[PDB]
Design an enzyme around this catalytic site. Structure first.
Site, PDB file in Angstrom:
ATOM      1  N   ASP A 101     -13.388  -9.963   5.645  1.00 45.93           N
ATOM      2  CA  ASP A 101     -12.273  -9.411   6.411  1.00 45.93           C
ATOM      3  C   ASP A 101     -12.606  -8.000   6.889  1.00 45.93           C
ATOM      4  OD1 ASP A 101      -9.856  -9.824   7.644  1.00 45.93           O
ATOM      5  OD2 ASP A 101      -8.642  -9.204   5.922  1.00 45.93           O
ATOM      6  N   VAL A 124       0.835  -1.194   0.000  1.00 39.64           N
ATOM      7  CA  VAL A 124       0.000   0.000   0.000  1.00 39.64           C
ATOM      8  C   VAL A 124       0.875   1.252   0.000  1.00 39.64           C
ATOM      9  CG1 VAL A 124      -0.254  -0.378   2.485  1.00 39.64           C
ATOM     10  CG2 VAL A 124      -1.666   1.343   1.328  1.00 39.64           C
TER      11      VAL A 124
END
Ligand SMILES: COC(=O)c1ccn(Cc2c(Cl)cccc2Cl)n1
Length: 266
Positions: free
Chosen positions: A123, A18
């Site tokens: 998730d 990320v």
């Protein structure tokens, strides 16, 4: 119907790990590079990206584009200035009850939209709830749980995880298929963390002790919430983390009860 913007690395100046990336004409975006190495998947990857680009809701992060180049594969998505929910909760400036209630309603709204579209998040956790400067939230899939092709690409050989929010039927049982009720349990622990301003189970000693505890009915300590918590939210908490998945409500059912309570009392 709508198409995916196919982006190139050239229209991005640089990406700082990320990763945050600046688009030369569009500004700040979050870039998740998934693959770097040595083509047969370029079609199933963009078709999956087109399937995911259809999900459009004010409380779900937008997939702005994909980068499909030779040995380079990335996903580009919105930038949220304040980070994830846990980072905002652990900041010294206290978040009022009106903002916390608004966040909960927006999580419910985004979860009901994804489930109504048949998408199971699998998730849901504070790391996957991103916040902007106006304290509005958007649900993300940073682990690529629902991106089946892109996760297969992520785990490929030639390409150079908390349990606090997992439903107990998935602890010590990888063959259990996650359902909408699994997301409802995750929402329950997120509810607790919103008011406790921290992660649960700080006094746990070992992972195997924690797993056996949760599977036997142990839950985050409600008494550990020092902040004020409405009676209705504690009841919603305990209802959504029930051991039996069929006893947990659905997000439309949670939405029908929580919205009048939020508008009238928060
Ligand atoms: C890939 O990077 C991301 O985090 C991301 C991008 C878009 N979304 C929204 C989304 C969710 Cl929340 C759940 C399932 C499918 C989709 Cl498309 N998440």
């Amino acid at each position: 119907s709508l198409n995916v913007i196919k982006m190139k690395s050239s229209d991005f100046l640089e990406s700082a790990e990320v990763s945050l990336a600046f688009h030369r004409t569009q500004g700040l975006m979050i870039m998740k590079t998934v693959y770097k190495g040595p083509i047969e998947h370029n079609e199933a990857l963009l078709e999956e990206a087109k399937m995911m680009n259809r999900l459009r809701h004010s409380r779900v992060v937008k997939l702005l584009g994909v980068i499909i180049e030779e040995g380079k594969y990335s996903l580009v998505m919105e930038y949220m200035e304040k980070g994830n929910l846990m980072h905002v909760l652990k900041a010294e400036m206290s978040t009022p009850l009106s903002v916390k209630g608004r966040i909960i309603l927006e999580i419910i709204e985004g979860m009901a939209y994804l489930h109504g579209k048949g998408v199971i998040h699998k998730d849901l956790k504070p790391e996957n709830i991103l916040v902007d400067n106006d304290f509005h939230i958007k649900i993300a899939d940073l682990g690529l749980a629902s991106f089946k092709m892109w996760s297969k690409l992520n785990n490929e050989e030639h390409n150079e995880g908390t349990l606090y929010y997992m439903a107990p039927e998935h602890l010590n049982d990888v063959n259990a298929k996650p359902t909408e009720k699994s997301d409802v349990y995750s929402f329950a622990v997120v509810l607790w963390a919103i008011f406790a301003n921290k992660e649960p189970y700080e006094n746990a000693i070992a992972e195997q002790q924690l797993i056996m505890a949760i599977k036997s009915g142990n839950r985050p300590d409600v008494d550990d919430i020092t902040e004020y918590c409405p009676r209705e939210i504690i009841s919603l908490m305990k209802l959504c983390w029930e051991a039996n998945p069929e006893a947990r409500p659905t997000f439309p059912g949670i939405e029908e009860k929580f919205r009048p309570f939020y508008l009238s009392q928060l």
